[PDB]
RNA sequence: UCCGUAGCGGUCCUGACGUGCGAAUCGGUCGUCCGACCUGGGUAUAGGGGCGAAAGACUAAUCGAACCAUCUAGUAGCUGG
RNA sequence: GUUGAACAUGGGUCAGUCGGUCCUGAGAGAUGGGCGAGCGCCGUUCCGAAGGGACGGGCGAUGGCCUCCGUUGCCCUCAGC
RNA sequence: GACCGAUCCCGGAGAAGCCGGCGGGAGCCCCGGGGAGAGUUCUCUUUUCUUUGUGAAGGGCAGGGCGCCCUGGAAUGGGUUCGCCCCGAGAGAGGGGCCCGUGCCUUGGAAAGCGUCGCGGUUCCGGCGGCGUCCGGUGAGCUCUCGCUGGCCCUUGAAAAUCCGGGGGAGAGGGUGUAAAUCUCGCGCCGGGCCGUACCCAUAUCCGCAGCAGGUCUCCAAGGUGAACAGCCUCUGGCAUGUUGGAACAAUGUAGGUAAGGGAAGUCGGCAAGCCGGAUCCGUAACUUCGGGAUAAGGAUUGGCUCUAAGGGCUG
RNA sequence: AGCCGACUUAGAACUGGUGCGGACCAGGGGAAUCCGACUGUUUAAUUAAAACAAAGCAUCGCGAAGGCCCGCGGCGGGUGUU
RNA sequence: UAUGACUCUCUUAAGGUAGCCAAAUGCCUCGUCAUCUAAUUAGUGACGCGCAUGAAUGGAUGAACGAGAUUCCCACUGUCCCUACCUACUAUCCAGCGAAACCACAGCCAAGGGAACGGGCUUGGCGGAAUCAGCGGGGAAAGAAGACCCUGUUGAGCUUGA
RNA sequence: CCAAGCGUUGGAUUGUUCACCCACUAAUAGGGAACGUGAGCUGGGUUUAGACCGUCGUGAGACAGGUUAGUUUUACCCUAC
């Protein structure tokens, strides 16, 4: 048959993202000798829309250590931060919002985002607009810290690792129903060609695996094993129960 | 009523082909290809949102025909920096100096007590 | 159209050259075969590739 | 006088997307486009550039915020407990 | 959002035409016309592949597997000489 | 048809300022590297000793009112992308 | 009118969406007159038609804008728009400053151009002359452009070449003069190489086997009627009826119409055709997601002519 | 008080063989049933639809050495400037 | 009188719940009743015993919307009773220019027989140059080596417990 | 019985053939002609490709089971008239 839609996203070159008006790849600052061993302070210049993304991003300005010039960073803007604001990085900078710090400095309990699932990468986990995670525990032997992430699943990550205190900004961005299929395309427009979804029930068998017959219906379990090939892998993929969520 | 018709070869409303109408001692109407409207520049402390005076509105490289005293304001930062964020800076560069000399004489203060 | 290039404005003058009628005196020749130019063009029915 | 009875902004959608749809997108639209009041300059010129974007007219002062307010119950909360837990770390 | 022009499209007459103006056009009547709108140029994706608001549609008048050359004078218990 | 976009003879396109030329866009595409039996392919900063430059000084020579600049040879210095 | 300064750093310009409203300036149109030349004149018409100007660049002045400054301190709150909006983080009220000035004047520049009349060259002439190219008023007008302000986005609407300003102060220059280093000021000198440039651009120069009713991206956009870039007529410009003419006016066609009386009895089926239609005045149901339905449905009026009333600026 | 100008609105009288949006332009209407919410799209050349899409609703996988997918192959590639 | 809440029995993982219906879904069927008509296999509203309705293989409803499907009424008309007349371009004729499809030979019928529907054969009827404008009965008229059906030890698209 | 000379209608419903009803009438008899008649029409039904429902099938799909939309070409030749 033919190659179903789900198989040809992978090869590119029209489901490729569209990242011609992004304003760049929102991360961390990179560690050195200031953020390891006190901390460093820069300032909120502007707050910016970049598209394909609920959250906004922050232009940071710090000035280098090494070298007489100002470097620019794009943080993803904690709730409550403004323009003129100062952001300290490091191990010894206080507990405030829009404040990054290693986990292991701040108590139990603390509200994080842009937190790193390894030392080192410059952000990568609860980042996406108004989520966070919660630190949890501590293990000051062998340096581990256990915190809450947004899905529930709790993780061990290293304790030298960074976060920036807060939530995301630009919560709630769900709550605010879509009325309309011009502004579904409007918001997929900006990040990929992936919303005009045609059900494979839809379909001709050549094109999916669920199409074909003379009623719209799919024949056969729509739950399938996680080894399966692809071009076979639709529907409920892997799946522990299929049916409406009552109680937990 | 006289229509009229393009002097160049490219044949599109574009940007760069605008024009507008001047009368001729022929007696005749014609388009003249206009230059784009300049603007004056933006302060760099980055708040204002007004564009700073004293300094003419042309395309950039017109700049290299002007004379510095069409480019600048007599004043420090003068024709880069309007003069309410000049002002502002002198007396926090002054003040935040001041502060730092009142925290080293109270650390002193401290110390000789201590 | 009149935004021409060079390689194309000289092929173009080579097969303006070539489309010019047999001299008469070559059919005055002893060994002599050709009554006219089969290789003519014309604009409007044969339209040069390109 | 009163042109409506009780739609406000949705009467622009007129007869469409639905009564319940509509009075859900009600109070976001109210409050997205209503003009709050600037904590720097203490005029009432802050007004929502983007999502999470409020921008104040007189001070131009711009602030990460909600999305649809100026400020969401999910965060003033955050605030309050991160200067709590600040406190507590230095005792 | 409604009537409606340019534009885009193509309901009905199952009208004209049907060795036609035309290997899909014409007339009246029609749908839409600030937005999921229309459009030029540049660029990306190539045949069991692409691309598809999904009709097995489109992919140079060719599509339920394009076109060109070769294997190839492929085989035919079948048809005609 | 005394006519033509037909045929036959001859002519006709003049630029610092109008465009191309330059820049980058989506993208294309070498080298390093990797893969590959192989034509080659991938990849565009990714496993790279990736700068042939400049000011000031010291050294050396050249040529002219050998006055004072300019020239290149070497070293010190500085340099992001 | 200039007004030294490098490595280095900071910033700006290039460099920004869509829509609505308003204001300014052009071009075109409009009205009232002066000229010049034509048209009508059977009767009337101080009548009708055409034309009646100034480039780039520089200087000056209107005009438009300012989220620019100084004085001063405002509630009995004021200022103000079409809407908004602004103000003890300084409103009004006075006085200044800057930007754009595509508008006007001047240099260009009347020498040239155009209209009209007349002389030359018997003609081969950027030929020579006489006059004129004037004074005003208006606009929810149309187009272009500039500016102000607002709305929309789970849409936030390009980069680089290139150019400039600033912060720093390594350095350089002269000892009181035929002063020096230096200059983004005014002139003066030389140069700008290579390629394209004709014509068609579409019911005949392109693609459809063709001079094929098909297809093919843009700029300009007069008068009247009228809401209108609708339809109809006209001016500038263009063309010859779309690969032929003449004579007949039969049927059957194709494209248009009209029909007494009845009014879907025709037909699978109101197919096709017909009715209605703009604007003003009233009037408007069931149902509903209260937004709609809705031009619901329903009626009345509409010409021409002669008047009246109301709706504004300028000056003292 | 004087001087200027732009289009409208309303009312009245008179008047034509009741004709007057005189050409042009220019919605037939109502009571109901079935289906699809609607706007949009679709078989270029027999099917414009009740088909597709759509917002809303609801499940499924995945915390990155991962989910889904591409690739003859690489410390390969898309989603992912996530 | 009937229907029959209730009971018994057989049973599978339950035995179709709320709704809804001769529906775009009901064979019987033009189901029965009411309404709409003078007359209705159509329409609408009820009835449910439902061959074979039914709850995100979504059920029921429902404003606005629809070049979607159906029924009725007002108004309107050549759709019709029942046709007629007029206009334009043809068709007609002429001057000039000028193809194509198709073609065993060709072309008047009745009956017989025949490969069971003759232009030709047999027996009868009979038949007369060359042509023009129409016309659609025939040429089992033309186009296209039947797409329906069957065979082939011929294939392709698609599916799966081959 | 001789007898086909002359007539045998207008409508609601259904694509119908058939059927059934209303009304008029003199009677509203039955049939054939390639189940007369598509280069005469129409395309309602049937009978391609698009879709919906019910049943069946794991599925692709099937249903003289319903529903909707779905290109009707040519005479100028010979004969007959
Ligand atoms: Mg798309
Ligand atoms: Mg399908
Ligand atoms: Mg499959
Ligand atoms: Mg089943
Ligand atoms: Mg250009
Ligand atoms: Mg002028
Ligand atoms: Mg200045
Ligand atoms: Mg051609
Ligand atoms: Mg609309
Ligand atoms: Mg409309
Ligand atoms: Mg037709
Ligand atoms: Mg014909
Ligand atoms: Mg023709
Ligand atoms: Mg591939
Ligand atoms: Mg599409
Ligand atoms: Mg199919
Ligand atoms: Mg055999
Ligand atoms: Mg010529
Ligand atoms: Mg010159
Ligand atoms: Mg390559
Ligand atoms: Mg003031
Ligand atoms: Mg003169
Ligand atoms: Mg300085
Ligand atoms: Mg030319
Ligand atoms: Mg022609
Ligand atoms: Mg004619
Ligand atoms: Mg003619
Ligand atoms: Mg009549
Ligand atoms: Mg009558
Ligand atoms: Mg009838
Ligand atoms: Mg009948
Ligand atoms: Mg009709
Ligand atoms: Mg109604
Ligand atoms: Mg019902
Ligand atoms: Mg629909
Ligand atoms: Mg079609
Ligand atoms: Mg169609
Ligand atoms: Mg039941
Ligand atoms: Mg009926
Ligand atoms: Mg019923
Ligand atoms: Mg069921
Ligand atoms: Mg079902
Ligand atoms: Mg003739
Ligand atoms: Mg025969
Ligand atoms: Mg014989
Ligand atoms: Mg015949
Ligand atoms: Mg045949
Ligand atoms: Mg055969
Ligand atoms: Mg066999
Ligand atoms: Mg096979
Ligand atoms: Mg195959
Ligand atoms: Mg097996
Ligand atoms: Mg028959
Ligand atoms: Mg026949
Ligand atoms: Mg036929
Ligand atoms: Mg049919
Ligand atoms: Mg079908
Ligand atoms: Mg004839
Ligand atoms: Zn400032
Ligand atoms: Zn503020």
């Known amino acids: ?248 | ?114 | 159209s009149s935004h021409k290039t060079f390689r194309i404005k000289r092929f173009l003058a080579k097969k303006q050259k070539q489309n010019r009628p047999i001299p008469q005196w070559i059919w005055m020749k002893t060994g002599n075969k050709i009554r006219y130019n089969s290789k003519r063009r014309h604009w409007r029915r044969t339209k040069l590739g390109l | 006088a009163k042109r409506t009875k009780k739609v406000g902004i949705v009467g622009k959608y007129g007869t469409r997307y639905g009564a319940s749809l509509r009075k859900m997108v009600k109070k976001i639209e109210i409050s997205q486009h209503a003009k709050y009041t600037c904590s720097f300059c203490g005029k009432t010129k802050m007004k929502r550039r983007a999502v999470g974007i409020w921008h104040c007219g007189s001070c131009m002062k711009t602030v990460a915020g909600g999305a649809w307010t100026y400020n969401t119950t999910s965060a003033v909360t955050v605030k309050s407990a991160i200067r709590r837990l600040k406190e507590l770390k230095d005792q």
């Not at chain 1, 460093?40 to 502007?46: A, F, P, T, Y």
């Not at chain 1, 803007?77 to 404040?99: D, M, P, R, S, W």
């Not at chain 1, 989520?131 to 992430?149: D, F, G, Q």
């Not at chain 1, 709550?175 to 059900?199: E, F, S, T």
Request: aromatic share 6%; charged share 30%; proline share 5%.
């Open chain 1, 1 to 248: 048959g033919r190659v179903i839609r789900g198989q040809r996203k992978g090869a590119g070159s029209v489901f490729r993202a569209h990242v011609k008006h992004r304003k760049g790849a929102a991360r961390l600052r990179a560690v050195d000798f200031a953020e390891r061993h006190g901390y460093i302070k820069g300032i909120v210049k502007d707050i910016i829309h970049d598209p394909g993304r609920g959250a906004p991003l922050a232009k940071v300005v710090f000035r280098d250590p090494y070298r007489f010039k100002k470097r620019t960073e794009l943080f993803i803007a904690a709730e409550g931060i403004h323009t003129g604001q100062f952001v300290y990085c490091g191990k010894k900078a206080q507990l405030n919002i829009g404040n990054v710090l290693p986990v292991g400095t701040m108590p139990e309990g603390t509200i994080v985002c842009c937190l790193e699932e390894k030392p080192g990468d410059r952000g990568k986990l609860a980042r996406a607009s108004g989520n966070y995670a919660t630190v949890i525990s501590h293990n000051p032997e062998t340096k581990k810290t256990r915190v809450k992430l947004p899905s529930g699943s709790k993780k061990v990550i290293s304790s030298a690792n960074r976060a920036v205190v807060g939530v995301v900004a630009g919560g709630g961005r769900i709550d605010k129903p879509i009325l309309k299929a011009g502004r579904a395309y409007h918001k997929y427009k900006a990040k990929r060609n992936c919303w005009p979804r045609v059900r494979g029930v839809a379909m001709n068998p050549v094109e999916h695996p669920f199409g074909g017959g003379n009623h719209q219906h799919i024949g056969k379990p729509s739950t399938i094993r996680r080894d399966a090939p692809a071009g076979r892998k639709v529907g409920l993929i892997a799946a522990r129960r299929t049916g409406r969520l009552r109680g937990t």
């Open chain 2, 1 to 114: 009523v006289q229509r009229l018709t393009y002097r160049r070869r490219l044949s599109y409303n574009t940007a760069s082909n605008k024009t507008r109408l001047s009368r001729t001692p022929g007696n005749r109407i014609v388009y003249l290809y206009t230059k784009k409207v300049g603007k004056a520049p933006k302060s760099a402390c980055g708040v204002c949102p007004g564009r700073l005076r004293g300094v003419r509105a042309v395309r950039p490289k017109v700049l290299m025909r002007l004379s510095k005293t069409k480019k600048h304001v007599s004043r420090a930062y003068g024709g880069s920096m309007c003069a309410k964020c000049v002002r502002d800076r002198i007396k926090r560069a002054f003040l935040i100096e001041e502060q730092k000399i009142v925290v080293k004489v109270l650390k002193a203060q401290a110390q000789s007590q201590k």
